[PDB]
Design a protein around this ligand. Structure first.
Ligand code: HPA
Ligand code: HPA
Ligand code: HPA
Ligand code: HPA
Ligand code: HPA
Ligand code: HPA
Ligand SMILES: OC[C@H]1OC[C@H](O)[C@@H]1O
Ligand SMILES: OC[C@H]1OC[C@H](O)[C@@H]1O
Ligand SMILES: OC[C@H]1OC[C@H](O)[C@@H]1O
Ligand SMILES: OC[C@H]1OC[C@H](O)[C@@H]1O
Ligand SMILES: OC[C@H]1OC[C@H](O)[C@@H]1O
Ligand SMILES: OC[C@H]1OC[C@H](O)[C@@H]1O
Ligand code: NA
Ligand code: NA
Ligand code: NA
Ligand code: NA
Ligand code: NA
Lengths: 245, 244, 244, 246, 243, 243
């Protein structure tokens, strides 16, 4: 009957799903929609059916971190999701360019997790569906919201120690735009499961300058509003695209 | 100023913390206590002050999976936690011996995560603290609750695919007792940060037999009760041992 | 001072470059163009300035294999190249769907090389530029040439042995579309060097069926013609997009 | 047939076994016992039956290094040993706290070998039996011998070069107490073969300070005596527990 | 009928083969032989039958880089080659000792490729055949050409970046003599296929000093002539030693 | 003062050293010599000064296994050894060809240890000195003792479990000849410390057929004698060169 961790049935899963880390953000999103229906809330996983621009799609929280989000993503992908967009927060790895409150839309990720490696060899790319990427970009443009594009570092380590150096500076040099914790895992599971994925992120600080105070847990309100509008617009567009085809 | 994810202050961190994966379990635990004070609930991290046998210790949810729980464990360990017990659920890797509803107290874990390896070389052991392990066993004995002891596989993969073999059969052959998702990460962070750690776990099925229906999300009620009484008793003892 | 292997000057590098494995193919491609100027031919590296649709871009061969093509790509990327499209041949990993003579436009690749790992950690993705991918797709559509899209396995091993199993079946299960030898190396070097990359590939057989005679390195004529038309259209278009 | 390297029979293997690296230490241990029976001495592997406090248990040398000790431990574990305590020497990784002559009882180890990795994936822990650990600690207490506790780094490299940096400072930062060469291997083999293991070690120097002469393989004699008494007492105690239960 | 990349038949393969990176070099070697017969040229793989001192052996180019040369080497080893000598160019990893133009004959190599690892575990050595090494050395002394001997680093990376350190300095400290791109791949494939291998290399610069001019794409002409004389003489001796 | 583990002084170390695993073999060897002087016996490390064919060289035991032998080898290489030959026992990886009692002379090895990896990256070859190899082979030929040549797998695992597959069958398919536990470690330390190394090994069984009784660690006496004569002759011949 009910999925094991989402506690919703196969029949409640829609072709398009918006995922977010923070079950709090699901509440912020659902009020922006035309209407919504709360489906379930188990553990970190809160599921709401959204109605927006004539379309029906779930918004589901995935929790912090790749192993816990993989549980969510597998239950979605194995039970009928066709398109999953992650809308999340991130740190800037290009502090001269990308600042707090800026928005980045990402087409690929660094697999600095474990779960993707337990599913497929490390040489395999974490890459999004490029039409989902294009839809996110197009929606930002339609909405007159400037955005960055680039690779996300998805790292399982949020707090580094002083023993093993963090790879973040290496990846900055390699031109990764941003760092968060879940996108690579989504992308790999999606590819493996024939599910189209993408990622849009809001910057909350720069991990190179956390000792300087370059962090705020409270996201820039109008920029957060803009990201949700872009993410919802893209989900509705991909839902109408899916429904036609 | 509050911890970034826990959203409690450093002053609110007690020497002993009981951690669980499911925020819903915090409510089940806190009502077993003599009294409790709700502190915060942010993301999947719910924090309550428990009072039990005259002692005071936090109960905090850490969510599913090693990277998410590491955020919780670092915030506790960097801000004054001295002892942390994980009370969680697990699958049996020894189905002939360890059955649904049984309880395992674990002394060490397999580091099938990523974050511990981002903190220290993979050769380093995920090992719990002796006194914690011993207190858990002694409490089970006093409560007359049979338990197993053994190594946990802490794996970031809950749902395997058909491409890369799961290592679970290998580790069963190596005499690992159970599997869950967080314990190795706790142990390694605790060793690195000089925090004493331990784990007690309730069996909810067997991953080798999920296709036969050997799984139930609803934990055997009396055994969950016993596990909680053991964990709370050990937390209270360790809180007085710490004073001492 | 000439580039060490290409034997052309920095001054001769154009923003857009079309790369191919076979120096013989550079000569097939140039005659399709409006006009051309031969620049150099050293080792496997043949360089020709192409004129097409009022645009100017190099076509340069890179030889067989990741280490040799990296020398080519580094010399291009460090001396003024801004967009590099690889037009190559490949095997199908999905023989029921993708057949000899079909064309695949690839957005990402498996890094089964060494040189990319000597440049950046394994976890980093081999991923192409969206604009380049989109332009290649749009030109195929404008020419009414059907194409597949997907991930290529870029493997340094063409001939497997009987000791260490090939990962090709694993990657087929993982939904990789095709296999060749250079594309992951191109994509990683491009990302590190801020150069936009992409790949278009023609199927010459299926490695799973070589023992059945499912192979022919005489590429299907009208299909090779189609792929060259799309690649040249995309280069010309991207040359003007760069100018803007 | 005799065991290939120990050259004793399966029938001579006792439930409890004390192992040491140095065959010479088997000579210092045995004369401490009530009585002993010299069994065999083949290659670096010297085996004696010890009789101490009413109990009977082998003492066996395992040689220097993880691959050589694995041969010994496999022959013991595959032929009836149920408890193996290693009593060894080690270097300090915490020179401000742990000094030459001090004794450390360890309950897990860093797997800086190869043979354990040829037997099980690297993520698997090298961990001791915590009853064995507790018995060693309790014996140290009864004898009024202060001890340290913590993780040993078990490294196959004794003499580092200037090319690949040693991981020893890393592991010092990670709170590993001491370094030696065999304990991880014993622990992993014991876990795989259902044999309870533990480790007690005497400090002979600090590897960070070898260039300053912080080393002497002449072990502090009164502390070596103490370590032997703790190890023998723990073996005898575990032997009785074994016999009562079995 | 024809090998996929070399486009020669099995019947055209001689027991001894000289391999070189550059197809241009096959043309330069062949004209130096007593006579020759061009066989094939496809992609970067050019195949010519050489006749020298009464013996015959192919000279075949393998291209730049391990994956490209493995295609060539597999085709030779699986179709009847019995002895393969690589003659090539290299950088010095010992610049106080081994200079531009110097000649190094190598008995083993560092496996800094991927293809050898896709064939056999990384712990397996890249090692050449003794007789081949000894024959090379003996021809060198015969012709009174000083040579060095040691290990080559065969690295898939010619141009390092500033993110992941090159291991070349480590391998210099480890006493590797020189660096090039193909020899370890030849050695491993040879061992796996029961084919006897070896390497002779001429130094064209030092990768530690490229940023100060220690490089020249013109190989010292007379030292190069000497290297090739050594290589051809050895191929002839081995074609008889094999015989 | 004394070497930590060998318990001899640097002054006692000769240019050429013969190493064996078993201290009992040192006692066996020394009595074949013209004369000897017992120097030290500490732990597994027994040191004797041998006098054979007018030459002087140590014979020292290194114990079982790579980590223990590395301690012996570093002490030798860091205090004056120039040439080290290992004379050991091994299992056959090619049981149709190489049988109990056969002798193999080896010139490279699989690095299935840890200590070599803690000293240099895994891609680096474990390779013997080719002059030492040649000296061993020539000594065998002139004593009319047939020998095999090839790669040894040096594996830290003697007793495999049923969880992780042994790589031995893979290495047999890769044409490795025999398996033992120390040679790769010797070769790597020697290359790093500029010491010339080599290995001669007598087969005591086949690990693929241990469950059929294909083992006896009583080495074939006449064959052990032959190996010792070969190793001793090579040590002397190499010792005349030091100067
Ligand atoms: O800076 C960060 N690092 C990792 N994850 C994040 N999510 C928001 N900011 C960050
Ligand atoms: O079977 C399991 N596997 C991983 N985590 C778990 N938590 C409860 N059961 C399990
Ligand atoms: O099948 C193939 N495998 C690898 N490279 C290729 N290039 C064309 N076809 C192939
Ligand atoms: O300092 C040491 N290092 C490694 N092993 C040891 N055994 C005793 N001391 C040491
Ligand atoms: O310096 C070099 N590095 C790599 N390959 C080479 N081939 C000639 N010189 C070199
Ligand atoms: O069969 C063997 N395996 C490993 N080491 C050995 N030493 C002698 N025989 C063997
Ligand atoms: O605060 C950490 C969280 O924000 C972004 C990141 O991906 C993680 O879930
Ligand atoms: O259902 C999975 C959860 O239960 C136990 C495991 O550790 C994880 O948090
Ligand atoms: O035949 C192998 C060649 O064709 C395509 C492949 O990428 C390589 O260059
Ligand atoms: O000298 C080093 C030896 O002593 C302790 C170490 O474990 C090794 O056996
Ligand atoms: O310059 C690069 C080429 O020369 C030697 C090297 O092996 C490569 O093939
Ligand atoms: O019996 C094992 C011993 O013999 C040869 C091997 O290398 C080891 O020292
Ligand atoms: Na989580
Ligand atoms: Na050419
Ligand atoms: Na090439
Ligand atoms: Na891109
Ligand atoms: Na030993």
């Amino acid at each position: 009957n009910l999925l094991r961790h989402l506690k919703i049935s196969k029949e409640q899963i829609t072709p398009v799903v918006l995922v977010v880390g923070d079950p709090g953000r699901v509440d912020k999103i659902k009020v922006v929609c035309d209407s919504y229906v709360d489906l379930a809330y188990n553990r970190e996983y809160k599921s709401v059916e959204c109605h927006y621009k004539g379309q029906k799609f779930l918004c589901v929280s995935h929790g912090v971190g790749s192993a816990g989000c993989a549980v969510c993503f597998e239950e979605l992908c194995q039970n009928g999701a066709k398109v999953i967009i992650r809308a999340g927060s991130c740190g800037s790895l290009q502090p001269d360019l990308i600042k707090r409150g800026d928005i980045c839309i990402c087409n690929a990720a660094v697999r600095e997790d474990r779960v993707s490696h337990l599913l497929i060899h490390g040489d395999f790319p974490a890459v999004g569906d490029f039409d989902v990427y294009d839809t996110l970009n197009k929606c930002a443009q339609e909405l007159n919201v400037p955005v960055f594009n680039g690779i996300s570092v998805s790292s399982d380590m949020y707090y580094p120690n002083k023993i093993i150096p963090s790879r973040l500076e290496d990846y900055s040099k390699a031109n990764a735009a941003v760092v968060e914790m879940e996108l690579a895992t989504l992308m790999v599971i999606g590819t493996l499961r024939k599910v189209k994925t993408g990622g849009i992120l809001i910057v909350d600080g720069c991990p190179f300058k956390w000792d300087e105070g370059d962090f705020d847990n409270n996201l820039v309100p109008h920029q957060l509003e803009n990201m949700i509008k872009i993410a919802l617009g893209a989900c509705a567009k991909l839902a109408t695209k899916y429904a036609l085809e």
